[PDB]
Structures are given as C-alpha cells and as structure tokens.
Write a protein that binds this DNA or RNA. Sequence first.
RNA 1: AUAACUGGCUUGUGGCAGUCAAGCGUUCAUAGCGACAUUGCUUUUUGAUUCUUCGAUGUCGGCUCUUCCUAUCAUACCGAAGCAGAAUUCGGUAAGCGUUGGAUUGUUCACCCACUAAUAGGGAACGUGAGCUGGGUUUAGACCGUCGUGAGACAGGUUAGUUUUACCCUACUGAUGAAUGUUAUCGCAAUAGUAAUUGAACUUAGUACGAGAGGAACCGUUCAUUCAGAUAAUUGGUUUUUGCGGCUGUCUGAUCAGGCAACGCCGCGAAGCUACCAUCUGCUGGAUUAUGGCUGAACGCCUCUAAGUCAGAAUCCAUGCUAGAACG
RNA 2: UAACGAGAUUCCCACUGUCCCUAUCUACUAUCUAGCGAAACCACAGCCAAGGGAACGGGCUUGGCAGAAUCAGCGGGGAAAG
RNA 3: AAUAGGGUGAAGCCAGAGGAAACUCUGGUGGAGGCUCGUAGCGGUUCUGACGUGCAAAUCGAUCGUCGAAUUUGGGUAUAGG
Lengths: 386, 63, 131
Amino acid sequence: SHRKYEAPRHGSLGFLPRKRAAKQRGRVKSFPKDVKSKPVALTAFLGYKAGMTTIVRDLDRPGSKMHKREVVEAATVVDTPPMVVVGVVGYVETPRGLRSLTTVWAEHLSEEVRRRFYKNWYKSKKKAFTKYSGKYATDAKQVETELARIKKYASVVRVLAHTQIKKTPLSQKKAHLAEIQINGGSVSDKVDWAKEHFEKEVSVDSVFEQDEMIDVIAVTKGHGFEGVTHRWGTKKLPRKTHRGLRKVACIGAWHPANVNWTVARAGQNGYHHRTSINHKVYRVGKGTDEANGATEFDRTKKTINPMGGFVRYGNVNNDFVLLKGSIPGVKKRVVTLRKSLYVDTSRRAVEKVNLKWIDTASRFGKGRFQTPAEKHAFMGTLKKDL
Amino acid sequence: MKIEVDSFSGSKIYPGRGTLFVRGDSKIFRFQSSKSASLFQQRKNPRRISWTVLYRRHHKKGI
Amino acid sequence: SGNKFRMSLALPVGAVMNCADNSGARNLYVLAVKGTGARLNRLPAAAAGDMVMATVKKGKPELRKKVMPAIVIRQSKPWRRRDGVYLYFEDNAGVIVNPKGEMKGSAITGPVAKECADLWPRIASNSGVVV
RNA sequence: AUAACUGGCUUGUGGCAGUCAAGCGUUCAUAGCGACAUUGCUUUUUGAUUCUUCGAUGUCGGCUCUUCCUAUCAUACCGAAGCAGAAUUCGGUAAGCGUUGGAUUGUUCACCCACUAAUAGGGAACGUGAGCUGGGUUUAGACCGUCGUGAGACAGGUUAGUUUUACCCUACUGAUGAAUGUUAUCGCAAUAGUAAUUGAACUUAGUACGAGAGGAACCGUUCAUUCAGAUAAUUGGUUUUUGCGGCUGUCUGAUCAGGCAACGCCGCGAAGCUACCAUCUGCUGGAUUAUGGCUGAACGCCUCUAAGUCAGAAUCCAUGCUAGAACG
RNA sequence: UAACGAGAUUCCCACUGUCCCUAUCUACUAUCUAGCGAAACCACAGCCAAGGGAACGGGCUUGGCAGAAUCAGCGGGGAAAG
RNA sequence: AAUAGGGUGAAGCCAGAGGAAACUCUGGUGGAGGCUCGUAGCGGUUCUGACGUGCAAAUCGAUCGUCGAAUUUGGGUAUAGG
Ligand SMILES: O[C@H](c1cc(C(F)(F)F)nc2c(C(F)(F)F)cccc12)[C@@H]1CCCCN1
Ligand SMILES: [Mg+2]
Ligand SMILES: [Mg+2]
Ligand SMILES: [Mg+2]
Ligand SMILES: [Mg+2]
Ligand SMILES: [Mg+2]
Ligand SMILES: [Mg+2]
Ligand SMILES: [Mg+2]
Ligand SMILES: [Mg+2]
Ligand SMILES: [Mg+2]
Ligand SMILES: [Mg+2]
Ligand SMILES: [Mg+2]
Ligand SMILES: [Mg+2]
Ligand SMILES: [Mg+2]
Ligand SMILES: [Mg+2]
Ligand SMILES: [Mg+2]
Ligand SMILES: [Mg+2]
Ligand SMILES: [Mg+2]
Ligand SMILES: [Mg+2]
Ligand SMILES: [Mg+2]
Ligand SMILES: [Mg+2]
Ligand SMILES: [Mg+2]
Ligand SMILES: [Mg+2]
Ligand SMILES: [Mg+2]
Ligand SMILES: [Mg+2]
Ligand SMILES: [Mg+2]
Ligand SMILES: [Mg+2]
Ligand SMILES: [Mg+2]
Ligand SMILES: [Mg+2]
Ligand SMILES: [Mg+2]
Ligand SMILES: [Mg+2]
Ligand SMILES: [Mg+2]
Ligand SMILES: [Mg+2]
Ligand SMILES: [Mg+2]
Ligand SMILES: [Mg+2]
Ligand SMILES: [Mg+2]
Ligand SMILES: [Mg+2]
Ligand SMILES: [Mg+2]
Ligand SMILES: [Mg+2]
Ligand SMILES: [Mg+2]
Ligand SMILES: [Mg+2]
Ligand SMILES: [Mg+2]
Ligand SMILES: [Mg+2]
Ligand SMILES: [Mg+2]
Ligand SMILES: [Mg+2]
Ligand SMILES: [Mg+2]
Ligand SMILES: [Mg+2]
Ligand SMILES: [Mg+2]
Ligand SMILES: [Mg+2]
Ligand SMILES: [Mg+2]
Ligand SMILES: [Mg+2]
Ligand SMILES: [Mg+2]
Ligand SMILES: [Mg+2]
Ligand SMILES: [Mg+2]
Ligand SMILES: [Mg+2]
Ligand SMILES: [Mg+2]
Ligand SMILES: [Mg+2]
Ligand SMILES: [Mg+2]
Ligand SMILES: [Mg+2]
Ligand SMILES: [Mg+2]
Ligand SMILES: [Mg+2]
Ligand SMILES: [Mg+2]
Ligand SMILES: [Mg+2]
Ligand SMILES: [Mg+2]
Ligand SMILES: [Mg+2]
Ligand SMILES: [Mg+2]
Ligand SMILES: [Mg+2]
Ligand SMILES: [Mg+2]
Ligand SMILES: [Mg+2]
Ligand SMILES: [Mg+2]
C-alpha cells in the first residue's frame, strides 16, 4: 500500500556516505577553469579558522526594506599568515585523466614543512631532502632540465605551498602543504612564475580582493556515533513506545528483502568534507596594522581580537580574512579558501562592502566593553589598581 | 550605530546585544543580557542590587 | 502589499490571543494562517504582521461563532530584526480586519509591531505607538 | 483431502480506454459530447476455484519510514476551442518535484471546517506488530434485547481484558584491517550517488484586449514556503563549573568553617552542546521529448521529412558536490 | 434518586514536551579490560534480478557480479525462534 | 494477638437571650458513626512502566483502594474427589 500522506525525504542523497573524511585537510576537488588571457595568479589559499564576530554594515540593495539602513551580521575570522612556495608540479592530459609528470622542489625547505614528512620527528635523523638539496650543486642543470620538461609537456601547473603554522597560536608544529593551481598565462609563464617564487612568501592580498565571493573547503565538526533523530532528523516515535523512541520505525518493506541504501540509520555524524560557496570577503586585514578592528567611522585603535583573545584559539596577529556568515569546520581547523568557479554579476556579488563597526567584546561571556580603556573609564579605580 | 543603556543595571548595550522589552503600557526597557532581564522579570529593585550603576549613584560611590 | 523578512512564529493553530481593538471581541482563537504551505504534522503558525483566520471565543454574541480574518499586531515570542535586535512584547494581540486587511473596529490599545504597521497601512492609521 | 489471510489461474463484476456515428451543441456528427452496438486493457473492487501453508507465514486500523508505477491534482514547455481579455475545458512530452492542518468515527471508507500551486490515484506478502500501539475483531468475567423449556445462540449493542526472544547468518549504517620491497607526502579519477522546490508583493499596468464590465504576460527587483548542507557571532534553552549567592531541618559546645537530606531546595550562571526558537550558503554548459520551423523530393504543385537541418521542457548528460576501486 | 465509586462517557477552568519540534543534563548500563561464564537454535548453509517450479528460491536455469580477517549498531530477510 | 496522628461533631447534659402563651434562637459540654484524611497493616487500579532464557514458574518501581471493623492474623480443630 501507498503512504497515507506524502512527505519529503529526510536528508540529502548527494552527501553519502556520511562517513569520516579520509584526511583532515580539505582538498580542492576542482579549481577555476583556466583562461590564458588573464595574468598569472594563485587560485587558492590556506588559512586557520580563528572564530566568529559581529559587524554592523549599511546595506546598499535598492528595493529592500533595509536599504541604506544598518544591519547586524555574523562574520568569520580566518587567520591567514603568508604561505611559502616550495615546489611546482606539472600535469599532463591523458585519456585516463590528468597525470602528474614531475615535481620540482626548492633548495631550502623550512623545518615546519620538513616536519610534514615525519610521524616521529624527534626520533629521526632528519634526512629528508638532503640529497635533493645536493641536487642543486653549483649549476643545478638537472633541475632546470626537469623544469624544461614541465614547460614542454605539462598542461596544468600547480605550485606547492605550505602554511607558516609557527606564526599562529596553534601548538602544532607541522606545516600544512597543499597544491594550489596556477591560472593565467602560458605553461612556460606559469613555470617561470613558480621558479621565481621558490622559497618566497605569498600573501592573501595577492590572492583575494575585497568584496569577492569565495568558497571554503573544510572538514566539519565531529560528533561521533549518532542516532537517526539527530543524524537524519527523523520524527521521534510516541512517548509510550516499547524499547525506545529515537528510531526509524520501518526500515523497509518486506520486498526487496534487503535494507535499502536510502533508509536513515545510526552512524557517524560530522567530520565530513564540505565545499561551501559564495562567502563574501568583508575585510582582508593586515597583521602589521594596529587598527585592525577600526573602520572609517569607528577610529578606535583596536585589533580584530576580542578581550581575552579568541576563545580556544588565541590572538590573530597575522593578516586575516573576514568572511560573511559561517564556514565549515571548527576553531583551529585548516580551511582552504578558493576563488569562485563562475562569474556572478548579481547585486549581492557586486555590492561594495563598507564596514561600520566590528564587535570586539569578550567571547568568553556576556562581554560589555570593547576595550580595556573603556572598561577603566566605566568602572573607575579598583582596589587591585592601587 | 548608537550605544543604548541598560534600564536595570545601566551598562552599555552594543549592536545586537541583549533584548528589548515592550511593556503593556508601551514603555521600552532594554536589557544587555539574561541576567538583568531575569532580575527585571523577577521584580528586583536596582536600588537594592549592589552592583548596578543606579545603586552606586544612590550610595554615592565613584562620584 | 509588502515584503517582510522571516520572523519567529509565535502563534500555532489553537492559540488564543488578546483582541486589541474596540470591535467588542475579547479573545481571538487562531485556526489558520494565510500562506501556510504543506508539511506533514507541522502546525500552521503566525508571526506579527500575518493574516490569520480566527474565531471569537469570548466577546459579543454577534461576533461569536463565526470565521473571520484578523491580523496579529504583537507577539510575546522574541524575534530578531535585521538590525540585530531581539525584541518581544508582554502578550500576543491581534485585530479583526476584512479579507482586504481593513480593520472592522477603529482603535488599537497598546503598541503595534513595526512589521505590522509597515505592512498594513490601516492598522498603522489606527495605531498609536509603533515599535 | 477442507474453510477463515497473502500469493497463483480467470476478469463475470469493479475500474479505465478505443472504434462506428443516430443525435446534442442558435447552424454544425466528431470545440466539447455522444445513444443502439462492438473491440480491448487492468488486477488498486468483489466474485469463482481450492493449487501452497492447519508438528502456526502473528489475522483490522493508525503512527513512523523508504521506494516504485502513471491512468498527471499542482509545477516546466506546448497543440486545440463554441480561446477577444481574465477564467476554464480537451489534448501532448513529461513521475524531476510536491500533494497539508483539524472536528466526529477503532475504522478502511466517509463527511464538514481551513489553508494551499495542489490538497491525484495506486503498489511493494491488501509494505511495515522480535518497529510501536492495541481503540476494533476474535478466548475465558458481566449487562441488555430478540430467540430457545433449557444448557445456550446472535456475523446485534455494551464494559473490563499478560502483545515474549536477536548475542547467529545475511543485508544496511558507520569503523578497523594482512598482502601485493619498506615508509612518508602530494595527487589522478573509473565507478556509484546527487538537489533543490514553489509562492507572493512591487514594476510592466489599470497597459494589451474589450462597447463596457472587467483585465493579462515576458525582462527585472525584494522577500517568502518546503527541502538540503554547515555554523555558535548574537538571542534563547540546557547546568555536576555542584562556580557564586540565598534558604529550611539536623549534626560538629558557640563563632568561623563544614557534613547529611538516595545531586536537599531556589536565583543567576560561563564553557560545551544546541533551535526556521538563531545565523549563513544552495552553480552553468551541452544534447533532446512534445511542439513550432527551413530547404526539399516522393507526387512537374504542395508538404517540418523521405536525405539534410533550426529552435526548444521542471527531461537527459555534463559542470559542480559526496565517496574514492581497501586486488585501479 | 441525596451520598458514595481506582466503574463507562462528554464539555469547561488550571496545568503542562502529549504535540508544533526538538534540544540539553545526571546516575546505571551498553563499550574496552582482568577474572568468571551460560542458553534458545542448528539438514547443509548464507549476495542479488528475472524465469520456471508445490503457482513468493540461499541452492535449479540465464544474467549482474565476486578479494583475507573483522568491531559497534540494526531490525528488511532467514515465509527466524517459542 | 495487632491496628501513629488529625477532621467532622450524633444522643445525653449545663447556661444565656427573646415572649402573655405556644415556644423559638444562641453559647458551651459531650464524644457517636459497618463516617472521613492519612501511617503500620490488608489489597492490587493505572503506567497496558521495568523484567520478560527475570532477583522471581507472578517479582520490582511509582501511582492507587481501604485502614476500628462484614477488619487483619498465628496456632488448634472440622469438612476429602461426582
Ligand atoms: O485461554 C487461553 C487463551 C486463549 C487466547 C485466544 F485464543 F483468544 F487467543 N488468548 C489468550 C491470551 C491472549 F494472548 F491474551 F490472547 C492470554 C492467555 C490465554 C489465552 C486458551 C485456552 C485453551 C487453549 C488455548 N489457550
Ligand atoms: Mg500518494
Ligand atoms: Mg520523494
Ligand atoms: Mg548525544
Ligand atoms: Mg507499552
Ligand atoms: Mg561565547
Ligand atoms: Mg544564556
Ligand atoms: Mg499527524
Ligand atoms: Mg487472488
Ligand atoms: Mg474485467
Ligand atoms: Mg466490465
Ligand atoms: Mg443537430
Ligand atoms: Mg486458499
Ligand atoms: Mg481438484
Ligand atoms: Mg509450517
Ligand atoms: Mg494454517
Ligand atoms: Mg516450522
Ligand atoms: Mg513463527
Ligand atoms: Mg515472519
Ligand atoms: Mg485471518
Ligand atoms: Mg503518460
Ligand atoms: Mg497537463
Ligand atoms: Mg521520484
Ligand atoms: Mg493487491
Ligand atoms: Mg498486510
Ligand atoms: Mg516485521
Ligand atoms: Mg509484536
Ligand atoms: Mg499490523
Ligand atoms: Mg480491546
Ligand atoms: Mg468474552
Ligand atoms: Mg423466554
Ligand atoms: Mg472491548
Ligand atoms: Mg480493568
Ligand atoms: Mg558519474
Ligand atoms: Mg498598478
Ligand atoms: Mg541541522
Ligand atoms: Mg551552596
Ligand atoms: Mg545547615
Ligand atoms: Mg553522618
Ligand atoms: Mg535515607
Ligand atoms: Mg549532598
Ligand atoms: Mg537560565
Ligand atoms: Mg550558553
Ligand atoms: Mg535563503
Ligand atoms: Mg516551404
Ligand atoms: Mg521533429
Ligand atoms: Mg529525417
Ligand atoms: Mg575493483
Ligand atoms: Mg585506493
Ligand atoms: Mg468500595
Ligand atoms: Mg453514554
Ligand atoms: Mg531473488
Ligand atoms: Mg507460474
Ligand atoms: Mg511467478
Ligand atoms: Mg508461497
Ligand atoms: Mg518466482
Ligand atoms: Mg531457505
Ligand atoms: Mg549462477
Ligand atoms: Mg562478525
Ligand atoms: Mg535489536
Ligand atoms: Mg528480519
Ligand atoms: Mg531454520
Ligand atoms: Mg485516627
Ligand atoms: Mg470507614
Ligand atoms: Mg478512609
Ligand atoms: Mg498503607
Ligand atoms: Mg504491584
Ligand atoms: Mg506491562
Ligand atoms: Mg530484555
Ligand atoms: Mg485459621
């Protein structure tokens, strides 16, 4: 017999299996499609999720009931110190897909990136890349030959860059190494750009501009083993049901005499790989600036950091990206910020953002002051102040 | 953006913080958090609540 | 004739709110909400500024025992405005109107939500303090 | 060997669809219908039979959840009208996507109220009881009415009546993992899955159309419904932070400071978790179906078709998203 | 027919997570370990689709396919057990 | 042989007030009842809760009926298979 009443599906069949990600670093499945006429530029950047804050902004959206009026909006802070370029990979188009032809590395790799190749660094002789460093012996023509091979045969060029995780408050010492595709120009131009950028730092302001819509690749918050009620949002059974109520009552008809792949079942929730698109960049802040949190209307010399630091992260002392809304992942998660895969000309995408004010009250409680100076002015002298 | 003042405790309210309460007589009270909001619905007297600004001015402290 | 942002629903079907106009009704019992789509087991629910089909449970006899439109003008369930402010009133109240949104009575006691006054010019006309 | 379920044959009956064309439709068989006849399909009705099961396949309905069919209620695109507009009716490709909240009844069914784009019909052992529930039926108690001399009967009414077991195999959901010299990092992408949906307001515009009454649409803009994936700024909820404060009884001679009251109780309460009870986000190319066309024969004319070809649907395949073959 | 009723039924006020629509917290389990250690049940066993067949197959025929050893859950099947 | 502590307040009795009488009204006292709230006790309504190869071949938890009599109960004794 048919259902007595109709209802939509619980959950999406486009995100199966709801299993743990194979890696904690989210990987860019697809890069922006290459257009030769543009200049040579990076298409992605790696950062660390610091925390969320609040802004106030005047909306510029004609026809809206909030037009030219202040809105209060949630924002995400991504701590993004410059990444270091250490390598370059050439890819060849084959009837079986892209195939990596050759990887050329820089002469000197920093310790934080050489720790990436070790499970037990303290017990090691730290021999990584020593013969390769010897490959640079006084003319390095074998290295130029490999670069020429990349120029001659590669159709897709990606750079190898790692984060400077020592500039973040994280206790982890391993850097995060990722391939970032180079778009624009010919293959020879891309290879020349990579070679001239070996062992150099690349900042966020060279990858992302303000008012851009960008995508975020990250692994979400882990919840462990979870039942159907919260994993899939199914209806709880009546209170008086024997053996419990947080279940799916019928997991299948008699035939097919198997449990179908479409029935909601208990299992692991969270820690999934997600690509979330169209997050607007409200601010590309600079770490050397002492007025990170100041705007053109609030000139209080103020960093982006709340009082007492970001809860369970620390202070953001680097360049940062202020994104609209929420992005996947937890605090301290490595986040991949990718340029958009299409051209959006909608008013939301082309709107120019001017921030009014950034919240810097404590996130560790109902903070009611924006600055220690303001707190002192409000409360006056205390006993501990003498 | 302008900073409001808590009707109960007198502390500054920044954009998005706390709640706004409209009494039956159309009078508007602003609370920065559920602490002062709860004491207000609990009918507490800020002159008798030792930490509010109103209390400190009533007892002439820091003036 | 208006486009209001989503608001926290305050009044499911079966709720009894106060009647804030001098039409002679004292209760307004919600039995439906205009614009409610289909979802299994989900009760229709109204926010401030929503048109509702209601009956008068307590009031004048000629107003009682009939189905009539009404508009919710205030709610005690806190809701967030686009300027970040979470606000709520002491009670849920509405006023009896036409199917066109024109009030039957002609006076409102107490404040009126700005979403409702912005969306219904007649209620704005008959309203005093608008929040 | 034989009844009361399912299943199987059949399809009278139920349901659906054709063809003929006397008539209806101011004229006019075929816009829309269509008598007298006649050909079929279906197994969502009910019969007929008694093939399987009586060393037992748990027999009503509802709740929950998934999927499939199309004979399409809505949504996309279209052809026809007794289509001026608006509305409506007939029809095509279409199951991608949705198809509700309640009063009464144990009900399937029904019947009203109301919202809605719509509140389409069905199947999966008349899906689904080691998933639940147990109102009904259908053990034993009891009452009534009719029937019987009586014990008792009623497919009549009424009330009360134990719903057992998974730790096995498989299948599903997740989680490890030997070996393809070792170990580490970065990758490719075969294959499998897939996702978005609908409405309103403003403008067009009181315009086209129309004697008037009435009264559209494309481009665009702002929002909203249902769904999906995250997130914890804010607000709310939660409190063994037993963090701070308060309170009762009793005990430590009093004070201070504490114990107990099967977390003693109360207010606040960070952090964490979490809510359309909060916020954010949900892509653009190609190929087609119906259909409308081009050139153009067959058939010296004509013809979208025969050769060739254009546009074109919520369709399909990609882009994008999820997994990554643990013997690629 | 006053009073009485763990009797059956309808409405109203209060009340509430019964529900919209779920979330959070505590103890004991479950979990992992040391020790101890059963039972039901068992022709052989255990991947699907269609066919025919005692007319609803794990085995037969034709296809799809198919890679050790496994852990927690689960209740579609074994026309599961009693 | 056993059955906390309360509530209600029947007869009988004492006193006062109002009146010509008939009498009426009021305040105390008293402590009745197969009365009542509620322990011990006896029972076993509902969750159709737990358990349901159990702690148990009928139990456990909360909730509940009754609780001074047609009460509960030990021992002795009688009645024995149509
Ligand atoms: O009294 C028993 C009994 C029967 C039945 C019934 F036949 F209705 F299903 N159900 C019984 C039940 C039941 F499950 F609640 F129905 C419990 C106890 C005994 C039952 C009978 C006595 C004759 C032998 C079979 N069991
Ligand atoms: Mg249906
Ligand atoms: Mg569906
Ligand atoms: Mg949990
Ligand atoms: Mg039960
Ligand atoms: Mg916080
Ligand atoms: Mg709070
Ligand atoms: Mg329901
Ligand atoms: Mg049959
Ligand atoms: Mg037939
Ligand atoms: Mg027939
Ligand atoms: Mg005629
Ligand atoms: Mg039979
Ligand atoms: Mg025979
Ligand atoms: Mg048998
Ligand atoms: Mg049988
Ligand atoms: Mg058997
Ligand atoms: Mg059986
Ligand atoms: Mg069975
Ligand atoms: Mg039967
Ligand atoms: Mg069809
Ligand atoms: Mg149609
Ligand atoms: Mg479908
Ligand atoms: Mg059938
Ligand atoms: Mg059945
Ligand atoms: Mg079953
Ligand atoms: Mg059962
Ligand atoms: Mg059943
Ligand atoms: Mg029953
Ligand atoms: Mg009986
Ligand atoms: Mg007789
Ligand atoms: Mg009964
Ligand atoms: Mg009973
Ligand atoms: Mg594919
Ligand atoms: Mg107009
Ligand atoms: Mg969610
Ligand atoms: Mg304390
Ligand atoms: Mg004490
Ligand atoms: Mg003690
Ligand atoms: Mg004790
Ligand atoms: Mg204690
Ligand atoms: Mg609280
Ligand atoms: Mg909190
Ligand atoms: Mg949206
Ligand atoms: Mg032509
Ligand atoms: Mg054609
Ligand atoms: Mg052709
Ligand atoms: Mg393989
Ligand atoms: Mg692999
Ligand atoms: Mg009795
Ligand atoms: Mg009756
Ligand atoms: Mg099979
Ligand atoms: Mg056959
Ligand atoms: Mg068959
Ligand atoms: Mg069979
Ligand atoms: Mg068969
Ligand atoms: Mg078998
Ligand atoms: Mg075979
Ligand atoms: Mg196993
Ligand atoms: Mg189980
Ligand atoms: Mg089973
Ligand atoms: Mg067996
Ligand atoms: Mg007593
Ligand atoms: Mg008694
Ligand atoms: Mg009693
Ligand atoms: Mg007792
Ligand atoms: Mg008991
Ligand atoms: Mg029970
Ligand atoms: Mg058990
Ligand atoms: Mg005796």
